[PDB]
Amino acid sequence: FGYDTVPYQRRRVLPQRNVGETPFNLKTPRYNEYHRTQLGFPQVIWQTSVR
Amino acid sequence: IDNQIKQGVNKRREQSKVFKLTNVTDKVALQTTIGAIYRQIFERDIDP
Amino acid sequence: MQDAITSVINSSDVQGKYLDASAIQKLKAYFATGELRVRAATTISANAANIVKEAVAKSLLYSDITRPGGNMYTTRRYAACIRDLDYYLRYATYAMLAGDPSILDERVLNGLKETYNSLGVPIGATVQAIQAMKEVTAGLVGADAGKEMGIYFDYICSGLS
Amino acid sequence: MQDAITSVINSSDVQGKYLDASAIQKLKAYFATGELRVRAATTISANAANIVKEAVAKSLLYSDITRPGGNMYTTRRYAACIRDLDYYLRYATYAMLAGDPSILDERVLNGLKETYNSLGVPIGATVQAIQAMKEVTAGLVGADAGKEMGIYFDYICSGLS
Amino acid sequence: RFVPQEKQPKAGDPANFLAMAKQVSRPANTVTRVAL
Amino acid sequence: SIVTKSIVNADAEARYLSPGELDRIKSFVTSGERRVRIAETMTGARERIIKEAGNQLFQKRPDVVSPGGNAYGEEMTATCLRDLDYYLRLITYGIVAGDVTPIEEIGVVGVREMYKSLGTPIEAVAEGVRAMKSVATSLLSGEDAAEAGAYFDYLIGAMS
Amino acid sequence: SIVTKSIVNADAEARYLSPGELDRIKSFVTSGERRVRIAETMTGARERIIKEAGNQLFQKRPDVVSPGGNAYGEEMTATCLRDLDYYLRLITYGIVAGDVTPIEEIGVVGVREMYKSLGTPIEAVAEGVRAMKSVATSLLSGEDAAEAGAYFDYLIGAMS
Amino acid sequence: MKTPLTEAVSIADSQGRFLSSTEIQVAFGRFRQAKAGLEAAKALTSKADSLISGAAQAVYNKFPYTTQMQGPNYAADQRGKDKCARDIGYYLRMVTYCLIAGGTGPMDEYLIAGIDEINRTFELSPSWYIEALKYIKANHGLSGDAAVEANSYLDYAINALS
Amino acid sequence: MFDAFTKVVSQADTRGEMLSTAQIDALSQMVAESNKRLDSVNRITSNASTIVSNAARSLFAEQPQLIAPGGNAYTSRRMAACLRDMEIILRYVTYAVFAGDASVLEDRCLNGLRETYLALGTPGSSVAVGVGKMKEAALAIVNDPAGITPGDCSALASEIAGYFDRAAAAVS
Amino acid sequence: MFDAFTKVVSQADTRGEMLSTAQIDALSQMVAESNKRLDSVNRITSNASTIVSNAARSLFAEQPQLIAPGGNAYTSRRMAACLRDMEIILRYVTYAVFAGDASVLEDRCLNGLRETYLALGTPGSSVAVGVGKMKEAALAIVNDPAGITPGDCSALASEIAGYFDRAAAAVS
Numbered sequence A: 001f002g003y004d005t006v007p008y009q010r011r012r013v014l015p016q017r018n019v020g021e022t023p024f025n026l027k028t029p030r031y032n033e034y035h036r037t038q039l040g041f042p043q044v045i046w047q048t049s050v051r
Numbered sequence B: 001i002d003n004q005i006k007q008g009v010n011k012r013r014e015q016s017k018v019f020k021l022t023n024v025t026d027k028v029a030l031q032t033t034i035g036a037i038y039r040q041i042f043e044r045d046i047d048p
Numbered sequence C, D: 001m002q003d004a005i006t007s008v009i010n011s012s013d014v015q016g017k018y019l020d021a022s023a024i025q026k027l028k029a030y031f032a033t034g035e036l037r038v039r040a041a042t043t044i045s046a047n048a049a050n051i052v053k054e055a056v057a058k059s060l061l062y063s064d065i066t067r068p069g070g071n072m073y074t075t076r077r078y079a080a081c082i083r084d085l086d087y088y089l090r091y092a093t094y095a096m097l098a099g100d101p102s103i104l105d106e107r108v109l110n111g112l113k114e115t116y117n118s119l120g121v122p123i124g125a126t127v128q129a130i131q132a133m134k135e136v137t138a139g140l141v142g143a144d145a146g147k148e149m150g151i152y153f154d155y156i157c158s159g160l161s
Numbered sequence E: 001r002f003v004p005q006e007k008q009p010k011a012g013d014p015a016n017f018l019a020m021a022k023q024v025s026r027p028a029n030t031v032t033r034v035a036l
Numbered sequence F, G: 001s002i003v004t005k006s007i008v009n010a011d012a013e014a015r016y017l018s019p020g021e022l023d024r025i026k027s028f029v030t031s032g033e034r035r036v037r038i039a040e041t042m043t044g045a046r047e048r049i050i051k052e053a054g055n056q057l058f059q060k061r062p063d064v065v066s067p068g069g070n071a072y073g074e075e076m077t078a079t080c081l082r083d084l085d086y087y088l089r090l091i092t093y094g095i096v097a098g099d100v101t102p103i104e105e106i107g108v109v110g111v112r113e114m115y116k117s118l119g120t121p122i123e124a125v126a127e128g129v130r131a132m133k134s135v136a137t138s139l140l141s142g143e144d145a146a147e148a149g150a151y152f153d154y155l156i157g158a159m160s
Numbered sequence H: 001m002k003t004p005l006t007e008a009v010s011i012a013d014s015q016g017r018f019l020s021s022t023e024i025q026v027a028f029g030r031f032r033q034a035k036a037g038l039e040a041a042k043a044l045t046s047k048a049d050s051l052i053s054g055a056a057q058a059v060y061n062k063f064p065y066t067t068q069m070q071g072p073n074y075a076a077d078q079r080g081k082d083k084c085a086r087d088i089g090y091y092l093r094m095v096t097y098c099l100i101a102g103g104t105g106p107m108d109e110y111l112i113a114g115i116d117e118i119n120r121t122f123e124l125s126p127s128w129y130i131e132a133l134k135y136i137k138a139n140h141g142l143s144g145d146a147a148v149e150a151n152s153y154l155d156y157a158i159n160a161l162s
Numbered sequence I, J: 001m002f003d004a005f006t007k008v009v010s011q012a013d014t015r016g017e018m019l020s021t022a023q024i025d026a027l028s029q030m031v032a033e034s035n036k037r038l039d040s041v042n043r044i045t046s047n048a049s050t051i052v053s054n055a056a057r058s059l060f061a062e063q064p065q066l067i068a069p070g071g072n073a074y075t076s077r078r079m080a081a082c083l084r085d086m087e088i089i090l091r092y093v094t095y096a097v098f099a100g101d102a103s104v105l106e107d108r109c110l111n112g113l114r115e116t117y118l119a120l121g122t123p124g125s126s127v128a129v130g131v132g133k134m135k136e137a138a139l140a141i142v143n144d145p146a147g148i149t150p151g152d153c154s155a156l157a158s159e160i161a162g163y164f165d166r167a168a169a170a171v172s
Ligand SMILES: *[C@H](C)[C@H]1/C(=C/c2[nH]c(/C=C3N=C(/C=C4\NC(=O)C(CC)=C4C)C(C)=C/3CCC(=O)O)c(CCC(=O)O)c2C)NC(=O)[C@@H]1C
Pocket: B044, C065, C071, C072, C076, C077, C080, C081, C082, C084, C085, C087, C107, C108, C112, C115, C119, C121, C122, C125, C126
């Protein structure tokens, strides 16, 4: 990159393939499962019904 | 089937197991004998 | 008490002949599908208090039969009916791993019609609970085993009705 | 009852820390010599009716007791002095295959010392009969499996002393 | 016909029916230390 | 009733009723006009215990009516009131029988299988009878609620 | 061990080890290295397999985290980490033994009176185990999801 | 989460050193702040519901068009008023959270970081929230140094808005 | 990263022969309707901010748990990231219907974003329903001929609904 | 990365309501004892190099296999890395007892370093025993009086021993 070039994902796609490697922003999101469990997020859809 | 299961020893006299109590310091072998006492004296389960 | 190994090996015994090629295709049918049965056997025992729970919620509960006057009002016997509905659940698995309804004749349907009319329990309400239990099982274990486990469920509904 | 697999399970479990590299090594201490120990058992299972007569032939076939006027002279109690040799053999090969003296504490030696007084039976002859059984059980099992069985018979006669 | 209807387990009176606080928990607990 | 416990206690001896057991009916029947003059107000005041039973349970056990609990929302606060309405009757049914044995054969003896299966906690229904105990003792006189309060307390010890 | 109850099932019939049983005790030893590495993964990842799975319990049963509950607060769901770790411990002991007798010696038969004295419904705990089974098999391979989960289904049936 | 102890640990960690007397000066200062700030947060917790309704009424008073014109962004219908006063209570709750935390971190992480694009996408004027925060900072009724730093947090929210 | 034409070229090269005639008539009809494809694409593109705001508007009316505190889209920063995720999905849908191939939509979003939403704790169901509602509103906005000559958008409603359903199913 | 105050703020925001009064009295007592907490911290911090040198020496007197050739801490470079690992653990303990929360100690060390010591071949047992001995010496250095006014040092012994046991158990 030298001093004057913005970094980019080097050689993601091979010239004969319509599908390359996963973009790094999708491969490595802001946090993993470990920090997700600490935040106590509420998954599993919703609570449910009374019957 | 009339010659199979219908011979005269109704085949559960010699394929039903018995329960001994040789293992009084074993604990899980004790628990399936105590249920076998409950399921032969009262011969239902005594749970309800 | 018999088994699809044994009931084709004893019926060939009592005819005096040996392992016929028509008799050899029933054992290898049982040896092909036996891996499907043993993984289906563990999943019933892991859910055995929950197949009986969803059966009574879909067929039995919140009705006239648990209302005083019905037979289920005594909690002596609502303890006993979950015990009774457990009996058809475990013996269906014993009919499943044997591949044979012969245990159900000798250990479930020995005198079952007389003892239900001696107490006056409803026949079809129990048969409605077997029809509850056959669809709860086929969802929890997969339809390839529920289409075989339900055959011995219809063997119970034939003898009960 | 405590298997040597379950004992090294138990020694981490009374501490409650998990199975370490030392604690998995005890299983690899069992599994590396596991193959000969299983193959030792099929030799002692087929020969147990055969090997029980040479133990008394080396020790107590003609002696001062087995004549008229001593113990092991009824043919009823001569059955007992063969069946106890069958009892000591069948429980040592359990204790061989598990690798413990604890099954020997629970089953064969839970009250065996006290009962031999009031029956009026010679103990010390039965000490020599197991000690004669070592050299006939090591001739057929090989030299390598003959020494690991020797500490399990020695727990019996030290326990019978 | 169709048998009609009447009563049992009518219930239907909320009475107090206390409203829910609707709380939730962090699960960042001291697994190592609970009590003596 | 108090006779029926002594009847099977007589036949287990297979002898006649001993007079240690006869006078316990003589204390019962002459107080039988007293005992029917206790529980009929609890049949009379019917709702007043019951509406003061749920609200006195929910402040001592509020996790039951939360989401995730068995009793939740509407139609599952009323059947928990109606399963509580069942166990109000058997306190009166034990009083006019003079013994706790008709409470058993219709209402106690199979609780630990049906409440295991339904998921309702047996401790939580035990505190509801402990919640309805205080409002029933206030409606009776103090020497009359002292015997009827133990009739609650057996079901407390049977549930717990 | 798979030895020691094949001992017990051969002891009650008063018989030696059958050669049909002797292959089963032979094939366990040659596959003993295959189960100790999948028990290493539960030894290594024991902290992750309880922490998110505990939130799967409270997502599906939020009655426990409600106030007035059995396991309420930062110190009492701490005790659920101080209790469910033993069940994650013992499944590893069920794997390396080959069968369910380390489960059967420690944590099965007294739990009806354990959790009654604790006051916790067992099926609330058991649905935490069945949700833990769904997240344990996320770590296992497609082959080892059955056999390591085969010792799970004994524990789910023991609670229920 | 810009709170003083957190940022002191971040300074000492990025420098790669242990804690010095600087962080302890930060600490005796933070305890001095919290010694009044916690009671002021409790007082705001007490007066919160009337402050929310007064801010909503002042916002309807200064901008009367929002009550009149049909539009899902405007609070003409009732659901607009429920959601509206809900975000009034959101702003007040973030003010109390920053009063407890001792820094602008909670409002910066819960409110500020996306508020511009949200008001851009939803056609919400931020001046409505500026009017509401001005009414809150006029009517909170505190006194002294707690009142000055409460006004500091509210003015910070105002400057972050516009 | 493929066109329609590059897709036919790659298939003809994997066959190893020249392009057959029927594929060329298909591509001629594609070149005749490619502008037709385009008209929907431009009227889809011009209303994009209204589409994503109405989609989030109906979604957060529908599932108020996301707006509720502790919800996944509750925080202002997270809610802005939510609208950003939706706008990105709509943009790559417009790219795929520009190039006439779903391979751009696959390449740019699909293979990673399912695992991203699992790892983030993002509920895939709500964003799946949001992409479905956004696609329904997008076809509803495209199909109305206001100041446009009379034509046929049949097959292109087919293609656009295909792209939106592929996005919603790859999200899950 | 959480304080005590930010922990109460995050819990109150997940509840969605204001902070209750009893939490505010708890935080007032925390603000009264927070200086308490941290004089304790300062006398822990001033003796840190003595703590890690006494810990390592005690440890290498105890397990001479690490000093023995072929041992994990045998090489001079590896031994310097060993002392660096110990000093890092002590520093993050001091950070966690500064902020009054274990979340900083979790965030900075715990989740990765167990896998790091597995992958490196580092015995987790020795460093666990070393962190335990270092924590015992740290409380022993903190608890003694030498020209300081009497105070309720106790509980904070509770908290510091909690942090050290959390570190030693996360190491394993
Ligand atoms: C329950 C689904 C229905 C019902 C039942 C009710 N059942 C009672 C039950 C009895 N059930 C049995 C059945 C078996 N015993 C066995 O060993 C086996 C095979 C393994 C079976 C199928 C028996 C023997 C009894 C009565 C003996 C006893 O009292 O223990 C009763 C109990 C009789 C009583 O007077 O208490 C009641 C109501 N009623 C319903 O509502 C359901 C249709």
